[PDB]
Amino acid sequence: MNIFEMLRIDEGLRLKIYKDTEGYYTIGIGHLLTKSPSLNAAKSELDKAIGRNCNGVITKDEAEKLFNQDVDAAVRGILRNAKLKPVYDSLDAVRRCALINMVFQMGETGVAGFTNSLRMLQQKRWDEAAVNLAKSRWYNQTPNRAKRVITTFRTGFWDAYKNL
C-alpha cells in the first residue's frame, strides 16, 4: 500500500463535478474546485485546471493528473511548513502517509492547527495522540475516514486499509 492507493480509497474517483461532504464543488480524486456556491464558478475553475473546455466532465487520465499534482503539492507543503516539517521528519514511512492524508483533506493550515496532537506524535506517544486527534470536528464530521487515519498513526501498519 502507498499514499496514492490510500487516498484513493478515502476519496474515491468521480469524473463529473460533485459536492464534498462539505457541500463543495469537487471533481476527480478529491480535487476541490471552489468553495463558491455556483456550479458556474466551478466549471470555470475546472477548465482553467485542465486547460480545455470540459463542460463539467473529465477523463480518468485528467483525474490522475490532478491527483499527481495534489499529492506533490501536499508533500511540498509539509516540507515548507515550520510546524509540519519537524513532525514529518520524525515519523516512519507508514505514519508519514497518515500525515500526508490529513494535509490533502484539510490543507496545511488546518493540520498545523492540531498543535497538541502534533506534539504527541513527535514524542511517539501513539495511543495518546489517537485519543487527542479524535476530539475534533474532523473526526465528528467524517468518522470512518478519521478512524482509518487514526489507526494508521496508532499502529504504524496498513490494517485499517486491508479491510477496504
Side-chain angles (χ1 to χ4, degrees), residues 7-23:
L7 280 159
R8 123 136 255 219
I9 282 151
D10 282 340
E11 291 291 349
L13 167 67
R14 306 239 232 318
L15 300 179
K16 192 90 218 300
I17 293 184
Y18 70 97
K19 301 177 173 188
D20 258 58
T21 298
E22 259 171 77

mmCIF file with all atom_site columns, all heavy atoms in Angstrom, residues 7-23:
data_model
loop_
_atom_site.group_PDB
_atom_site.id
_atom_site.type_symbol
_atom_site.label_atom_id
_atom_site.label_alt_id
_atom_site.label_comp_id
_atom_site.label_asym_id
_atom_site.label_entity_id
_atom_site.label_seq_id
_atom_site.pdbx_PDB_ins_code
_atom_site.Cartn_x
_atom_site.Cartn_y
_atom_site.Cartn_z
_atom_site.occupancy
_atom_site.B_iso_or_equiv
_atom_site.pdbx_formal_charge
_atom_site.auth_seq_id
_atom_site.auth_comp_id
_atom_site.auth_asym_id
_atom_site.auth_atom_id
_atom_site.pdbx_PDB_model_num
ATOM 1   N N   . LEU A 1 7  ? -5.129  7.207  -0.491  1.00 0.00 ? 7  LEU A N   1
ATOM 2   C CA  . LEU A 1 7  ? -6.003  8.359  -0.787  1.00 0.00 ? 7  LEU A CA  1
ATOM 3   C C   . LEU A 1 7  ? -7.085  8.005  -1.762  1.00 0.00 ? 7  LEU A C   1
ATOM 4   O O   . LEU A 1 7  ? -8.170  8.564  -1.787  1.00 0.00 ? 7  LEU A O   1
ATOM 5   C CB  . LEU A 1 7  ? -5.273  9.608  -1.309  1.00 0.00 ? 7  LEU A CB  1
ATOM 6   C CG  . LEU A 1 7  ? -4.632  10.407 -0.194  1.00 0.00 ? 7  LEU A CG  1
ATOM 7   C CD1 . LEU A 1 7  ? -3.541  11.286 -0.761  1.00 0.00 ? 7  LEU A CD1 1
ATOM 8   C CD2 . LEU A 1 7  ? -5.671  11.162 0.627   1.00 0.00 ? 7  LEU A CD2 1
ATOM 9   N N   . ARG A 1 8  ? -6.803  7.074  -2.609  1.00 0.00 ? 8  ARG A N   1
ATOM 10  C CA  . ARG A 1 8  ? -7.869  6.747  -3.483  1.00 0.00 ? 8  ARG A CA  1
ATOM 11  C C   . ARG A 1 8  ? -8.992  5.930  -2.901  1.00 0.00 ? 8  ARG A C   1
ATOM 12  O O   . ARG A 1 8  ? -10.153 6.138  -3.311  1.00 0.00 ? 8  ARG A O   1
ATOM 13  C CB  . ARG A 1 8  ? -7.327  6.346  -4.764  1.00 0.00 ? 8  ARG A CB  1
ATOM 14  C CG  . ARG A 1 8  ? -7.762  5.015  -5.161  1.00 0.00 ? 8  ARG A CG  1
ATOM 15  C CD  . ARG A 1 8  ? -8.075  5.351  -6.587  1.00 0.00 ? 8  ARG A CD  1
ATOM 16  N NE  . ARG A 1 8  ? -9.502  5.385  -6.629  1.00 0.00 ? 8  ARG A NE  1
ATOM 17  C CZ  . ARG A 1 8  ? -10.255 4.941  -7.606  1.00 0.00 ? 8  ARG A CZ  1
ATOM 18  N NH1 . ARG A 1 8  ? -9.776  4.654  -8.831  1.00 0.00 ? 8  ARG A NH1 1
ATOM 19  N NH2 . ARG A 1 8  ? -11.554 4.835  -7.320  1.00 0.00 ? 8  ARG A NH2 1
ATOM 20  N N   . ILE A 1 9  ? -8.697  5.191  -1.831  1.00 0.00 ? 9  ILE A N   1
ATOM 21  C CA  . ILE A 1 9  ? -9.700  4.517  -1.025  1.00 0.00 ? 9  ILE A CA  1
ATOM 22  C C   . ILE A 1 9  ? -10.500 5.605  -0.325  1.00 0.00 ? 9  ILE A C   1
ATOM 23  O O   . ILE A 1 9  ? -11.726 5.612  -0.367  1.00 0.00 ? 9  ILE A O   1
ATOM 24  C CB  . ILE A 1 9  ? -9.107  3.464  -0.084  1.00 0.00 ? 9  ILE A CB  1
ATOM 25  C CG1 . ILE A 1 9  ? -8.793  2.220  -0.891  1.00 0.00 ? 9  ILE A CG1 1
ATOM 26  C CG2 . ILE A 1 9  ? -9.980  3.045  1.136   1.00 0.00 ? 9  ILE A CG2 1
ATOM 27  C CD1 . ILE A 1 9  ? -7.641  1.527  -0.212  1.00 0.00 ? 9  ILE A CD1 1
ATOM 28  N N   . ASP A 1 10 ? -9.831  6.577  0.248   1.00 0.00 ? 10 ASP A N   1
ATOM 29  C CA  . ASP A 1 10 ? -10.522 7.620  1.046   1.00 0.00 ? 10 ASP A CA  1
ATOM 30  C C   . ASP A 1 10 ? -11.349 8.630  0.264   1.00 0.00 ? 10 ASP A C   1
ATOM 31  O O   . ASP A 1 10 ? -12.326 9.188  0.708   1.00 0.00 ? 10 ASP A O   1
ATOM 32  C CB  . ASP A 1 10 ? -9.495  8.292  1.949   1.00 0.00 ? 10 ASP A CB  1
ATOM 33  C CG  . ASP A 1 10 ? -9.152  7.458  3.178   1.00 0.00 ? 10 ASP A CG  1
ATOM 34  O OD1 . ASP A 1 10 ? -9.867  6.580  3.597   1.00 0.00 ? 10 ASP A OD1 1
ATOM 35  O OD2 . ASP A 1 10 ? -7.975  7.750  3.690   1.00 0.00 ? 10 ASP A OD2 1
ATOM 36  N N   . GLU A 1 11 ? -10.943 8.917  -0.935  1.00 0.00 ? 11 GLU A N   1
ATOM 37  C CA  . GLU A 1 11 ? -11.584 9.985  -1.637  1.00 0.00 ? 11 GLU A CA  1
ATOM 38  C C   . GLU A 1 11 ? -12.503 9.499  -2.710  1.00 0.00 ? 11 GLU A C   1
ATOM 39  O O   . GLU A 1 11 ? -13.360 10.255 -3.102  1.00 0.00 ? 11 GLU A O   1
ATOM 40  C CB  . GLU A 1 11 ? -10.507 10.797 -2.349  1.00 0.00 ? 11 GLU A CB  1
ATOM 41  C CG  . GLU A 1 11 ? -9.608  11.573 -1.376  1.00 0.00 ? 11 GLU A CG  1
ATOM 42  C CD  . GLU A 1 11 ? -10.309 12.710 -0.661  1.00 0.00 ? 11 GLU A CD  1
ATOM 43  O OE1 . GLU A 1 11 ? -11.487 13.029 -1.116  1.00 0.00 ? 11 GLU A OE1 1
ATOM 44  O OE2 . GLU A 1 11 ? -9.850  13.246 0.306   1.00 0.00 ? 11 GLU A OE2 1
ATOM 45  N N   . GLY A 1 12 ? -12.191 8.377  -3.348  1.00 0.00 ? 12 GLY A N   1
ATOM 46  C CA  . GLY A 1 12 ? -12.979 7.819  -4.438  1.00 0.00 ? 12 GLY A CA  1
ATOM 47  C C   . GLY A 1 12 ? -12.592 8.433  -5.777  1.00 0.00 ? 12 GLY A C   1
ATOM 48  O O   . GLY A 1 12 ? -11.635 9.176  -5.822  1.00 0.00 ? 12 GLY A O   1
ATOM 49  N N   . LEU A 1 13 ? -13.281 8.093  -6.864  1.00 0.00 ? 13 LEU A N   1
ATOM 50  C CA  . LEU A 1 13 ? -12.972 8.650  -8.173  1.00 0.00 ? 13 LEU A CA  1
ATOM 51  C C   . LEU A 1 13 ? -14.276 9.019  -8.875  1.00 0.00 ? 13 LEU A C   1
ATOM 52  O O   . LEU A 1 13 ? -15.133 8.179  -8.992  1.00 0.00 ? 13 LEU A O   1
ATOM 53  C CB  . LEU A 1 13 ? -12.200 7.642  -9.005  1.00 0.00 ? 13 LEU A CB  1
ATOM 54  C CG  . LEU A 1 13 ? -12.159 8.070  -10.464 1.00 0.00 ? 13 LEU A CG  1
ATOM 55  C CD1 . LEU A 1 13 ? -11.322 9.337  -10.575 1.00 0.00 ? 13 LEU A CD1 1
ATOM 56  C CD2 . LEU A 1 13 ? -11.473 6.992  -11.276 1.00 0.00 ? 13 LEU A CD2 1
ATOM 57  N N   . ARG A 1 14 ? -14.475 10.280 -9.246  1.00 0.00 ? 14 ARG A N   1
ATOM 58  C CA  . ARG A 1 14 ? -15.711 10.763 -9.875  1.00 0.00 ? 14 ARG A CA  1
ATOM 59  C C   . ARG A 1 14 ? -15.337 11.647 -11.032 1.00 0.00 ? 14 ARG A C   1
ATOM 60  O O   . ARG A 1 14 ? -14.538 12.585 -10.905 1.00 0.00 ? 14 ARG A O   1
ATOM 61  C CB  . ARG A 1 14 ? -16.637 11.534 -8.917  1.00 0.00 ? 14 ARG A CB  1
ATOM 62  C CG  . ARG A 1 14 ? -17.010 10.774 -7.615  1.00 0.00 ? 14 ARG A CG  1
ATOM 63  C CD  . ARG A 1 14 ? -18.515 10.549 -7.383  1.00 0.00 ? 14 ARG A CD  1
ATOM 64  N NE  . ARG A 1 14 ? -19.010 10.990 -6.054  1.00 0.00 ? 14 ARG A NE  1
ATOM 65  C CZ  . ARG A 1 14 ? -18.451 10.851 -4.809  1.00 0.00 ? 14 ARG A CZ  1
ATOM 66  N NH1 . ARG A 1 14 ? -17.308 10.177 -4.562  1.00 0.00 ? 14 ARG A NH1 1
ATOM 67  N NH2 . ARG A 1 14 ? -19.070 11.433 -3.758  1.00 0.00 ? 14 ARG A NH2 1
ATOM 68  N N   . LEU A 1 15 ? -15.870 11.307 -12.194 1.00 0.00 ? 15 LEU A N   1
ATOM 69  C CA  . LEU A 1 15 ? -15.467 12.001 -13.390 1.00 0.00 ? 15 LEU A CA  1
ATOM 70  C C   . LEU A 1 15 ? -16.312 13.193 -13.781 1.00 0.00 ? 15 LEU A C   1
ATOM 71  O O   . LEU A 1 15 ? -16.010 13.830 -14.806 1.00 0.00 ? 15 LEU A O   1
ATOM 72  C CB  . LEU A 1 15 ? -15.320 11.007 -14.526 1.00 0.00 ? 15 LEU A CB  1
ATOM 73  C CG  . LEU A 1 15 ? -14.274 9.911  -14.279 1.00 0.00 ? 15 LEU A CG  1
ATOM 74  C CD1 . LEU A 1 15 ? -14.302 9.027  -15.494 1.00 0.00 ? 15 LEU A CD1 1
ATOM 75  C CD2 . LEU A 1 15 ? -12.842 10.437 -14.279 1.00 0.00 ? 15 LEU A CD2 1
ATOM 76  N N   . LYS A 1 16 ? -17.346 13.467 -12.978 1.00 0.00 ? 16 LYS A N   1
ATOM 77  C CA  . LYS A 1 16 ? -18.296 14.573 -13.150 1.00 0.00 ? 16 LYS A CA  1
ATOM 78  C C   . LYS A 1 16 ? -18.260 15.456 -11.928 1.00 0.00 ? 16 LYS A C   1
ATOM 79  O O   . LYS A 1 16 ? -18.017 14.940 -10.823 1.00 0.00 ? 16 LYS A O   1
ATOM 80  C CB  . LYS A 1 16 ? -19.752 14.055 -13.399 1.00 0.00 ? 16 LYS A CB  1
ATOM 81  C CG  . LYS A 1 16 ? -20.721 15.142 -13.880 1.00 0.00 ? 16 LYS A CG  1
ATOM 82  C CD  . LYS A 1 16 ? -20.804 15.323 -15.407 1.00 0.00 ? 16 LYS A CD  1
ATOM 83  C CE  . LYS A 1 16 ? -20.951 16.783 -15.894 1.00 0.00 ? 16 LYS A CE  1
ATOM 84  N NZ  . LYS A 1 16 ? -22.158 17.513 -15.424 1.00 0.00 ? 16 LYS A NZ  1
ATOM 85  N N   . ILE A 1 17 ? -18.434 16.792 -12.092 1.00 0.00 ? 17 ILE A N   1
ATOM 86  C CA  . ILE A 1 17 ? -18.377 17.669 -10.912 1.00 0.00 ? 17 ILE A CA  1
ATOM 87  C C   . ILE A 1 17 ? -19.355 17.154 -9.889  1.00 0.00 ? 17 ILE A C   1
ATOM 88  O O   . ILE A 1 17 ? -20.486 16.801 -10.285 1.00 0.00 ? 17 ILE A O   1
ATOM 89  C CB  . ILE A 1 17 ? -18.704 19.121 -11.239 1.00 0.00 ? 17 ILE A CB  1
ATOM 90  C CG1 . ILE A 1 17 ? -17.625 19.709 -12.109 1.00 0.00 ? 17 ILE A CG1 1
ATOM 91  C CG2 . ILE A 1 17 ? -18.901 20.012 -9.999  1.00 0.00 ? 17 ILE A CG2 1
ATOM 92  C CD1 . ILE A 1 17 ? -17.913 21.191 -12.353 1.00 0.00 ? 17 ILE A CD1 1
ATOM 93  N N   . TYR A 1 18 ? -18.932 17.138 -8.618  1.00 0.00 ? 18 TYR A N   1
ATOM 94  C CA  . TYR A 1 18 ? -19.772 16.671 -7.491  1.00 0.00 ? 18 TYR A CA  1
ATOM 95  C C   . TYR A 1 18 ? -19.598 17.532 -6.268  1.00 0.00 ? 18 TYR A C   1
ATOM 96  O O   . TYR A 1 18 ? -18.727 18.363 -6.260  1.00 0.00 ? 18 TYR A O   1
ATOM 97  C CB  . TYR A 1 18 ? -19.561 15.160 -7.164  1.00 0.00 ? 18 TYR A CB  1
ATOM 98  C CG  . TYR A 1 18 ? -18.203 14.846 -6.533  1.00 0.00 ? 18 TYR A CG  1
ATOM 99  C CD1 . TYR A 1 18 ? -18.035 14.732 -5.146  1.00 0.00 ? 18 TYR A CD1 1
ATOM 100 C CD2 . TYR A 1 18 ? -17.100 14.619 -7.355  1.00 0.00 ? 18 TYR A CD2 1
ATOM 101 C CE1 . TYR A 1 18 ? -16.804 14.461 -4.558  1.00 0.00 ? 18 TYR A CE1 1
ATOM 102 C CE2 . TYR A 1 18 ? -15.854 14.359 -6.782  1.00 0.00 ? 18 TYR A CE2 1
ATOM 103 C CZ  . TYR A 1 18 ? -15.708 14.325 -5.407  1.00 0.00 ? 18 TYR A CZ  1
ATOM 104 O OH  . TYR A 1 18 ? -14.498 13.951 -4.863  1.00 0.00 ? 18 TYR A OH  1
ATOM 105 N N   . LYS A 1 19 ? -20.440 17.392 -5.206  1.00 0.00 ? 19 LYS A N   1
ATOM 106 C CA  . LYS A 1 19 ? -20.248 18.107 -3.947  1.00 0.00 ? 19 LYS A CA  1
ATOM 107 C C   . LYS A 1 19 ? -19.617 17.187 -2.899  1.00 0.00 ? 19 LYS A C   1
ATOM 108 O O   . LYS A 1 19 ? -19.986 16.015 -2.853  1.00 0.00 ? 19 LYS A O   1
ATOM 109 C CB  . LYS A 1 19 ? -21.508 18.712 -3.315  1.00 0.00 ? 19 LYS A CB  1
ATOM 110 C CG  . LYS A 1 19 ? -22.247 19.701 -4.174  1.00 0.00 ? 19 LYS A CG  1
ATOM 111 C CD  . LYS A 1 19 ? -23.531 20.207 -3.538  1.00 0.00 ? 19 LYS A CD  1
ATOM 112 C CE  . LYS A 1 19 ? -24.118 21.310 -4.388  1.00 0.00 ? 19 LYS A CE  1
ATOM 113 N NZ  . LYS A 1 19 ? -25.261 22.030 -3.807  1.00 0.00 ? 19 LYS A NZ  1
ATOM 114 N N   . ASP A 1 20 ? -18.619 17.767 -2.175  1.00 0.00 ? 20 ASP A N   1
ATOM 115 C CA  . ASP A 1 20 ? -17.889 17.436 -0.924  1.00 0.00 ? 20 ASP A CA  1
ATOM 116 C C   . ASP A 1 20 ? -18.843 16.926 0.111   1.00 0.00 ? 20 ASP A C   1
ATOM 117 O O   . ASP A 1 20 ? -20.005 17.327 0.167   1.00 0.00 ? 20 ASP A O   1
ATOM 118 C CB  . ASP A 1 20 ? -17.435 18.746 -0.104  1.00 0.00 ? 20 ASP A CB  1
ATOM 119 C CG  . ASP A 1 20 ? -16.022 18.958 -0.343  1.00 0.00 ? 20 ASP A CG  1
ATOM 120 O OD1 . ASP A 1 20 ? -15.820 19.089 -1.610  1.00 0.00 ? 20 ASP A OD1 1
ATOM 121 O OD2 . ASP A 1 20 ? -15.192 18.970 0.495   1.00 0.00 ? 20 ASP A OD2 1
ATOM 122 N N   . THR A 1 21 ? -18.252 16.348 1.141   1.00 0.00 ? 21 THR A N   1
ATOM 123 C CA  . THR A 1 21 ? -19.036 16.075 2.309   1.00 0.00 ? 21 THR A CA  1
ATOM 124 C C   . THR A 1 21 ? -19.487 17.399 2.825   1.00 0.00 ? 21 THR A C   1
ATOM 125 O O   . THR A 1 21 ? -20.465 17.470 3.578   1.00 0.00 ? 21 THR A O   1
ATOM 126 C CB  . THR A 1 21 ? -18.145 15.495 3.403   1.00 0.00 ? 21 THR A CB  1
ATOM 127 O OG1 . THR A 1 21 ? -17.617 14.272 2.921   1.00 0.00 ? 21 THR A OG1 1
ATOM 128 C CG2 . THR A 1 21 ? -19.072 15.242 4.581   1.00 0.00 ? 21 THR A CG2 1
ATOM 129 N N   . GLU A 1 22 ? -18.680 18.419 2.463   1.00 0.00 ? 22 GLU A N   1
ATOM 130 C CA  . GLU A 1 22 ? -18.878 19.788 2.891   1.00 0.00 ? 22 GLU A CA  1
ATOM 131 C C   . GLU A 1 22 ? -19.830 20.683 2.107   1.00 0.00 ? 22 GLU A C   1
ATOM 132 O O   . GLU A 1 22 ? -20.243 21.774 2.501   1.00 0.00 ? 22 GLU A O   1
ATOM 133 C CB  . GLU A 1 22 ? -17.679 20.402 3.565   1.00 0.00 ? 22 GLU A CB  1
ATOM 134 C CG  . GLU A 1 22 ? -18.116 20.261 5.015   1.00 0.00 ? 22 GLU A CG  1
ATOM 135 C CD  . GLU A 1 22 ? -17.069 20.571 5.980   1.00 0.00 ? 22 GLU A CD  1
ATOM 136 O OE1 . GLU A 1 22 ? -16.732 21.705 6.250   1.00 0.00 ? 22 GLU A OE1 1
ATOM 137 O OE2 . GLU A 1 22 ? -16.559 19.476 6.456   1.00 0.00 ? 22 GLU A OE2 1
ATOM 138 N N   . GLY A 1 23 ? -20.291 20.098 1.025   1.00 0.00 ? 23 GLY A N   1
ATOM 139 C CA  . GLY A 1 23 ? -21.086 20.768 0.049   1.00 0.00 ? 23 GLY A CA  1
ATOM 140 C C   . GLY A 1 23 ? -20.234 21.439 -1.003  1.00 0.00 ? 23 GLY A C   1
ATOM 141 O O   . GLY A 1 23 ? -20.764 22.210 -1.796  1.00 0.00 ? 23 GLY A O   1
#
